[PDB]
Structure formats: structure tokens, C-alpha cells
Enzyme design. Structure first.
Site, mmCIF file in Angstrom:
data_model
loop_
_atom_site.group_PDB
_atom_site.id
_atom_site.type_symbol
_atom_site.label_atom_id
_atom_site.label_comp_id
_atom_site.label_asym_id
_atom_site.label_seq_id
_atom_site.Cartn_x
_atom_site.Cartn_y
_atom_site.Cartn_z
ATOM 1 N N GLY C 12 0.824 -1.201 0.000
ATOM 2 C CA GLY C 12 0.000 0.000 0.000
ATOM 3 C C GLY C 12 0.863 1.258 0.000
ATOM 4 O O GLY C 12 0.615 2.203 -0.714
ATOM 5 N N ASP C 32 -5.116 2.891 7.507
ATOM 6 C CA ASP C 32 -4.705 1.573 8.008
ATOM 7 C C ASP C 32 -5.141 1.471 9.450
ATOM 8 O O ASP C 32 -5.256 2.489 10.121
ATOM 9 C CB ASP C 32 -3.184 1.410 7.865
ATOM 10 C CG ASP C 32 -2.685 -0.022 8.078
ATOM 11 O OD1 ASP C 32 -2.550 -0.471 9.243
ATOM 12 O OD2 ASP C 32 -2.356 -0.704 7.084
ATOM 13 N N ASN C 87 -9.826 -12.733 4.301
ATOM 14 C CA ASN C 87 -9.693 -11.613 3.381
ATOM 15 C C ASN C 87 -11.029 -11.092 2.893
ATOM 16 O O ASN C 87 -11.173 -9.902 2.635
ATOM 17 C CB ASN C 87 -8.789 -11.971 2.220
ATOM 18 C CG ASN C 87 -7.360 -11.904 2.605
ATOM 19 O OD1 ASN C 87 -7.048 -11.598 3.755
ATOM 20 N ND2 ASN C 87 -6.469 -12.191 1.673
ATOM 21 N N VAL C 110 -6.203 -5.073 -4.588
ATOM 22 C CA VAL C 110 -4.933 -5.814 -4.556
ATOM 23 C C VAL C 110 -4.934 -6.713 -3.315
ATOM 24 O O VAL C 110 -4.282 -6.412 -2.310
ATOM 25 C CB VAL C 110 -3.715 -4.892 -4.443
ATOM 26 C CG1 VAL C 110 -2.439 -5.726 -4.656
ATOM 27 C CG2 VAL C 110 -3.774 -3.746 -5.446
ATOM 28 N N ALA C 111 -5.717 -7.774 -3.336
ATOM 29 C CA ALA C 111 -5.783 -8.695 -2.200
ATOM 30 C C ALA C 111 -6.097 -10.040 -2.804
ATOM 31 O O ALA C 111 -6.803 -10.090 -3.786
ATOM 32 C CB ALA C 111 -6.918 -8.296 -1.253
ATOM 33 N N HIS C 167 -4.057 -15.639 -11.141
ATOM 34 C CA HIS C 167 -2.638 -15.712 -10.747
ATOM 35 C C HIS C 167 -2.197 -17.171 -10.723
ATOM 36 O O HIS C 167 -3.004 -18.077 -10.569
ATOM 37 C CB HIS C 167 -2.390 -15.123 -9.343
ATOM 38 C CG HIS C 167 -1.946 -13.677 -9.320
ATOM 39 N ND1 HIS C 167 -0.936 -13.185 -10.117
ATOM 40 C CD2 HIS C 167 -2.337 -12.643 -8.529
ATOM 41 C CE1 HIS C 167 -0.745 -11.902 -9.848
ATOM 42 N NE2 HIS C 167 -1.584 -11.551 -8.888
#
Lengths: 305, 305, 305, 305
Positions: C12, C32, C87, C110-111, C167
Site C-alpha cells: 500500500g 490503516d 480476506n 490488490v488482495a 494468478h
């Protein structure tokens, strides 16, 4: 965001290409009276876009339609009484043509005599004072910095300078407000050499004309493009420009070269730096010269010129 | 040209990545004692290279072979007497390891205490004085400029500052040699607020440690990378760094924070700025503190530490 | 324009710093849960701003107030069923927190697992499908390009590649749609070596974890920052991202890695490239794997997990 | 490193300014026969240097002394048999003048007819074949890419193209080796529209002349500057240029437009791409045209022209 450049000659085209290379604006439009010139230059710039790697669309046109809804306009069209009359007509006219379609824009003037042309554009625009300014100081300071950096053999990145007033003899140099890596330049360069550099800066435009027979464009164009970037980015640059002064430096009702804060609001502040007796006298002389030109304007208007 | 960074922790990796992004050096090599770390970071940077668009090759290694024939070395490995002893050992040792294979290099030290570690590296290097320097002033000034720009709401591009001496309490601020668009900052900010900013600059490192529990790296890394670029480009930046002084400011036989001209020859000149009585007294105090540390070095050597 | 980055860890913070360096956005805000971390990192980045020369303001916070009215959000917070559950909770939750204050934003996830987390964010957002996407393909292609450029000893600037799918094992490589200076890579590299490179690309994330014991951030951060720039600039990049497909490639009701046109409208088009029998079979397998994960989501929801 | 540009007209000055802006070379020298022109332009560029922020020194001169020990030379001086004769004289002559003082340089020719002028310079240089090349392909491809990007409304950054052969009718387009985000352009644009774009690319130079009455310079200058950067940086760009072929494509003893690897060694490799029957026939025709020009050279030599 959208930028118009009025005039597609050497200076205007340089402004356009420099703004396009920054890849901040969505589009840059060159408008010029000469059929085919802005079109050809814009096409050449578009064909360069994949090589340099910018996506800003550059357009060229002879009409004002394509300039509509512009955020910034740089006016570079423009060739003592004869010149003042001729450029007043050009600048006032293109300003009228432009603002009809872009009522929310900010204007940067690059036409001589610069301080008076900035006023002419302001009057033709119907905009508030903060939305109209002239490019001069950034060019003059870029020149002065380049000469200092050359003299000391130091990076241009570490030389900063402030210059006020008009162009040429009425330009007001401030060597004590000129630094190298934070060190005032009079500590590094002696008085006689500083004065040589000041005189070269005052005559820098003519020096180039004398060498190549026509006036500069790389540095003037870069300077106006820097001012354009500040407006587009709202980054609050502090730069010397021809700006409307209301009380600052004891000047009033006057566009003249002063340090300003530039951002989305155009001229957001006129900064007041301390001037000593001699500097005030120089600035007073320069202001006197701007007023003289303003007076000539009205005389030439009276006389049908 | 080839750059080595000793230490692949947060600061070293930041130096490496910043130099690689500049796309000036052919190769950047990170060397570190921890198996796998420089390798992993270098691989991650290489995989970023097509996205950012740089061709500088980044390598990571645990051995000094791959650092051979480097042009610039930045030493960031490094954790009062205990620290001085520990970092002296680390810095002296890695310097010895490095210079064997890169006899023609210029060294930039980033380890605390910074002025003394710069001397430790100089002594271990066998290089002339111009070829060894420490990064501190560029970080301190970057901090001071950022605080000034924030206070005035002006572009960081238009704020310049000079700071000398050591880090922290012995750092020597020069607000009158700090400008905004050429205007000395005391004309814009009042004394009490300038002093607040000076104190924040002195404690800036600790401030970050207090917030996040470990020391900074983005700004320290950027600062050392800027110094590296100046050497590689030979661009004659004027920047404050820990440099060997022979007579300047009346200091002798001493590495301490001073404005220098940086280029291919390393520290090419130590610039002497005018200091008033109070500033000289502050610099004298800071020099006294460096000498104290130098004295401690020899005491700890005597004692087998 | 304003950008929020959720998560101030390595990835991040890299996104934030890369966006800030581009100097396009007015502000970048890191949010955060860990007290002090985003604050410390943001302060360090602000102190680097005069050295690098960017005016983008970087802020760090533990609350969502300061993220309000953001134009782009990059979600990087995030650590098989256990992970999917954990997540999902993190990503869904931060998405809810964020969109309340930024209803007009575009989201880049982006996780992991990336395609499913992109869907989780889409569902939590209440946004249309074009406004939510995942970063994967740009990282995978950056990796593949870097390996090709290394193998041929050519500039990364001249290597282009397209990769689709998910991925890792379900990533779909397209060597015939990979070129060097316009020349398809199979004309330059033989099949066995291309397959080696494809396998390295599939396992690239794990390779770095195996070297240094934690996952990458320079390249993942650069990739998400590139996607952010495209949205902010409206420059119409064609890049592979996790995007909602309605009929393209015969996939439906699905977020998966596909080439898209990115601009101010988020995912403006899903481009359909020609896939041969084997490529379709690979993409079908990858889609099957995304659906499997989607199924697991609902099972874990059913079970109170 | 030091760069000379022969010819200070629109194209040469653009090359010089573009190289100077890259801030890689220490110095750029424009040499031209016209008293005052290179001097004036160089002075204007130097005065722009603090505004743009480059330290490359730009010099202008009418003599070859100041060009000595140059690393790269770009030859842009230059106005069917009459032209071939006139430009042969100009290019051969300036080459002789230049190489006396810069025996270790690499030469990039920008004069028409381009393939034959590249040979003329090679012969006058006394250099090996790898050290002399012509700029054409990078301009032609930049044009083709710009037209494709405009047609699809995609970023120029994501369009790549390969073109070979000569300029104009003998230029050899390779649409199947033209991609958008990795996707071959024939999958996105139909044949008739691709052929329109190919024809526009072939006539692009004349199109601009027809619009503004003189030939282009922004894109030609950018293209030669890109080739110069590759040599200076040794970054191994793969670009189409006029290069000496020994056996590649079955051509021999010939300078013609081919994809090459460019670096410190000049033309380091000529890459051989697969050409189908029609493409080979087109390349054969283009080679025939270069040989025709070479034949005319010797006829004009025979005749005292």
C-alpha cells in the site's frame, strides 16, 4: 483539462508542445489565422506523441469553435505607438474571440509590450483580475539563473532568482534575492560581475535577435508552459508574473511584474518582498513606464488608431 | 556506470530503487549479509522495471565480487559508546571489503553518528578526502523545506534551504538562507513559527520513530540517491553534505556538514557562506561534538572495544 | 483529484508513494488500522517531497473521514477456506467503510485471491461493474516482460506481453501475443525457453517469498499505481486487469483477468482477443477455478465463517 | 558524453533540444554554416535550461573545433539527380569535417534520400558499418502508431509497430507486427481501414508539407533523439533504422530500414523477422530502389556532378 494557445508561430507552438509533453492536459489546441500552419504543426506534434510518450491530444485550427471550454489560454499572437496600436488590436481581438467560448478560463499573455498587453487582454476578457496575467518574469529569471549557473559552474537546479518590474531597462533585478544552494549570490560573485550579468539579462532578448535575426522561443515558450502547469496542477508555485496589484508595493490599479502564488485560482496572492530605497526607486520608474504606455493607449484610441 | 549499495534494508533498498528509476546507471548492486534479502528485493525491482520503464539492472548479492569496478558506493549498513563501537566495526569492515574491488569509487555514507561514520569510512577506504562524504544535510533540508512549504501552502519546488553542522541538536539552521520563490523566509514567516519549524527539523528523525516505531527511509533514501545522481551526471549540485574541511569556516581536519559542489570528482569544492556570530557559535558547538565523538572512537579502540 | 490507499504496509505504501511521485493527484491518503504506521510513512513521504520534487500531499490516518470524496481507491489490506474467509472480511469491511464517504470513486483491488476479492469489493461497494477492478495482469506481464528482456538483452521498453486469467497455475500466458520491437517472441526465443519463462512467471510470487521470506511490493505497487494513473489521466491504457465480463470470451457474470481499456470511466471496454483451442481450454480452467472460489465463499457464509 | 548535431535548422535544433532535455549528455553542440543561427538557438536553449531543469550544456558554432571528441553525431544538414548530387555533397562534406575530430563517434543520418545518404556518410566516415545508421523507421512507426492510437482511442503507450524498407512508396508496413496492448491490430481494425492508415503513413511527410508548406520537425527530431539516447545509455532498444545488412533478409552490402539492437556499439545486431511472400516482394522492391539510387550516385560522380 483543456488548453488553448492563440498563435502557432515559434513561441505559441513551443508553448503547445511543452504543455503536451507534460501529459497533464487532455487536449491542447493551437489557433492561428494562417491557413494550414496550426494544422501542420499539430499533426507533426501528434505524430511525435508515441516517440515522446504523451497522450495529450494536440489540435490545430483557424477557428475558435475548437477552443471552447478551455481551462487555460496562452496568448502569443502579436508582432512605439505603431506597435502598441497593432498589438492592442491583435490581443484585444483574439481575447474577445476566445472568451466567448471559454468563460471560465485563465489567461496568460505573451505579447509586447508585456505589462500593457496583459491589461489589454484583461479588459477585453471580462474576467476578474486574478484570471489574467502576463509571462515575463519567469523568462527573465530563467535567463538570469542560466548566466549565474554558467559563471559559477553550478547546476541550474540550485540557482534561484527574483526579478520584478517590466522587460528590459525597466526590469528590476534583485541580486540579494538570488541564491546558489541557498547562498546569496553576492557572497560568491563580486559586484562588477553581478552588474554585467544584470545588464546581459536586461538585454537578453535583443542579444538573440542580434545573433540570429529573429526573437527567441525555447525559453519564452518554456516559461509560459511552466505557468500553465501551475494553474492546471494547482501546485502553488511562487513565480514572478505580470499581475494586477491592489496596494502591494504601493502600486495601485496596475498590472506589473511581481512575485505571485499561482494555482487553480490564477493569481491567488501577490507576495510583497522587502525592497530597499534603490529598489523602490527602480520599481517606481518601471511603474511610471507602464503608466506612460497606458496613457499612449488612450491617446491612440482617441486618434482612431 | 555502476553503483553499489551496501545494506539492503529499508534505507539501502530505497537508495537502490531510486537510483535505478533514474535510469542513469547501467547497474545497481545491493550487497547485504542476510542471505536472500538483497536477492529478493533486487528481483522484485527488476520485475518492476518494465512497469516503471527503466533499464538499469538491479542485482542483489551477499558477496563483494559483484560490486567490483563500482563508480559510486552508498553505505547504509549500520544499526553512545556501544553504538559508536558497533557501527564503526560495521562501516569500517564493509568499506574495506568494498574498496578492494572498486579502487576508483566515490563513497557516500549513511550511518550514524553520521559525521564520525563518514570519517571511519574515509580512513578505511584509503581514498583521498574528496572521494568520501556523508548524507545528512540533504535530508535535513528536505525536511525543513517540506515544513516551510506546508506552512505557507507553496510548492516545494520553490522552497530552498541551507542547513549545516551535524544531525539533531548540533544541526545548524540558517533561516535567513532559506527562501520561497527567492524571498527570504523570515519576511513571510514570523520568528516564533520559524523557531518551531527549526525545532521540528532537529527532532524529525525521532518524530517518525515515535509514530511508527522504526526510523525513516523514503526521505533518507531519496537524499542519498540525489547525491549519487550528482556524481554520476557531474552536474555540479550545491548541496550540504558531511565533507572534509581544510580551513573553511575555520574548521580543520574535519568531516562535518557543509555546502559543497558535487560532481564526478566527488566533493569538488567546500563553499564558504557568511556566518554571523551566533551561527559561528552554533557551528563551533557542533564541531566540538564531532571531536568528542572522534575522541570516544580512540578511547574505545584503546579499550579493545 | 484525490486517491485513497487502504492498507499502509509494504504494498500500500508503495502504491501511495508511486502515485505521489507522479505528481498528478492533489492528495494521496493512506488509511490503516495500525496506529501510527500510516502517519509515520506519510510524514516520511512528505519530507521526501522536496527532494523528489512532487507537490502531491500524502496523508496517513486510521479513520475514513480523511478519505472522503476520493476519485480512486486502491485496496491492499489483506493477509484456502481460512484465507478466503479472512480476506473476504477485511476487503468487504474496508470497502463498506470507504464507499460511504466516496460514492463516486473507482476501486482497484490488490488482495488475494485476487479475482474473488475483486468480486467481494464490487458487491460491498454498491458501484456499477465498470467502477471496480483487480490488479493482477499488469504485475504478471511486468514480470514476464522483465524475464524476456533479460533473456534477449533488450530494453524493457520494447517488450510487450499479454497475459489473462488468474494468478499462478490458472494464469493464461500468450507467448504469441508477446513481442520485442514488434517481433513476436516465438521468432526469437525457442519453445523450451519460452515455457521456462512462462513457468517462472506463474511462480514468480512464491519465488520471491522463498528468497526473502515475505511477498513482493515494488512491482505489485508499481502495477497498481500504473492503473491508478490511467484512471486519473483518462489516457485509455490497454492493460490486463481483473474485470467484469458480460459475454466476452464466452464468460458471463464474472470478474477475471482480461485486457481492458482503462480511463476516467474505470473499465471502459473489455477487449476480446482471438484465443485458439488450447488457450480457450486454459481460460476455461481458470474460470472454473474462480467459480470454485465463489462457491466456497457462499459455503463459508452459510457456515457462519 | 558529448553529442554533435550538424545542421541547426528546424530538425537539427529539435534533435539538440530533445537530447539536452534528457539531461544524459554533458554537452550538445550544434554546428551550421549560417553565421549566428546555431549561436542564437543555443543561447535560447541555455536560457531555457533552468526552467526545464537540465544541465546539459548546449553550444552553437560555425566551426568543427567545438565538436571534437563527440560520442554521437546526428547529421541533419541537407536540402531526383539534382537532389542526390546536392545532398551527397553536403552530407559527405560535413561527415569528413566532423570525423577528423571525433574518430570514435557513432553517426545517425537524417537527410534524404535517407538510405543512400546513410551510405554516403558511412563511406565518408572511415568508420565500421556498425557505427553509421540512418533515422527513418522510428519516425515512420511513430506516425503509424499515432494513427492507430487515434483510430482506436487508445494510449500511444500501448501501440507498437514495425516498419521496414525505405521512406514513402518503398516503405514496408507490417500490420500483423503491429499491436495494441499485445493484441495484433488486424484483430481490432478491419483491412480497409488498416490499408488507409498504411497509405497515410507512406505519405505522411508530404501531407505536412501540403498543409504548412515546409517539412516536419517535431516528430523527426524526436525520433533521432530517441536513437541518440539509446546509444548514450547503452539500453539495447530494438528499433527500425537504416542499417548495414550482411546477409539478413537475403540483402547484402546494403543500408536499408531494418529492426536493429542499438547500444553503445551502435548497431549491435540486425534482427531478422519472418516475412511472408508479399512482404519479401515489397522489401525486394524497396531494395531495388535503394540500388537504383546507388547507381545514380556513381553515374553523377562519373559526370562530374
Amino acid at each position: 483539462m483543456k488548453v488553448t494557445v492563440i498563435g502557432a508561430g515559434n513561441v505559441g507552438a513551443t508553448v503547445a508542445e511543452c504543455v503536451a509533453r507534460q501529459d497533464v492536459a487532455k487536449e491542447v489546441v493551437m489557433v492561428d489565422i494562417k491557413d494550414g500552419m496550426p494544422q501542420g504543426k499539430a499533426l507533426d506534434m501528434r505524430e511525435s506523441s508515441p516517440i515522446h510518450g504523451f497522450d495529450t491530444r494536440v489540435t490545430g485550427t483557424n477557428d475558435y469553435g475548437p477552443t471552447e471550454d478551455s481551462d487555460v489560454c496562452i496568448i502569443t499572437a502579436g508582432l512605439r505607438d505603431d506597435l502598441l496600436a497593432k498589438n492592442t488590436e491583435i490581443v484585444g481581438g483574439v481575447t474577445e474571440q476566445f472568451v466567448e467560448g471559454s468563460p471560465d478560463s485563465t489567461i496568460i499573455v505573451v505579447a509586447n509590450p508585456l505589462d500593457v498587453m496583459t491589461y489589454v487582454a484583461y479588459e477585453a476578457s471580462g474576467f476578474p483580475t486574478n484570471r489574467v496575467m502576463g509571462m515575463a518574469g519567469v523568462l527573465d529569471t530563467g535567463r538570469f539563473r542560466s548566466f549565474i549557473a554558467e559563471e559559477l559552474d553550478v547546476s541550474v537546479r540550485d540557482v534561484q532568482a527574483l526579478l520584478m518590474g517590466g522587460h528590459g531597462d525597466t526590469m528590476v533585478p534583485l541580486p540579494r534575492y538570488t541564491t546558489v544552494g541557498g547562498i546569496p549570490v553576492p557572497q560568491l560573485i563580486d559586484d562588477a560581475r553581478i552588474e554585467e550579468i544584470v545588464e546581459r539579462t536586461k538585454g537578453a532578448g535583443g542579444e538573440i535577435v542580434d545573433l540570429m535575426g529573429t526573437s527567441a522561443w525555447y525559453a519564452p515558450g518554456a516559461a509560459a508552459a511552466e505557468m500553465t502547469e501551475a494553474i492546471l496542477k494547482d501546485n502553488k508555485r511562487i513565480l514572478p508574473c505580470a499581475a494586477y496589484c491592489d496596494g502591494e508595493y504601493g502600486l495601485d490599479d496596475l498590472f506589473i511584474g511581481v512575485p505571485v502564488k499561482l494555482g487553480a485560482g490564477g493569481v491567488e496572492e501577490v507576495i510583497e518582498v522587502d525592497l530597499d530605497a534603490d529598489e523602490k526607486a527602480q520599481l517606481k520608474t518601471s511603474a511610471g513606464h507602464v503608466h506612460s504606455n497606458l496613457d499612449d493607449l488612450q491617446r491612440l484610441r482617441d486618434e482612431g488608431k
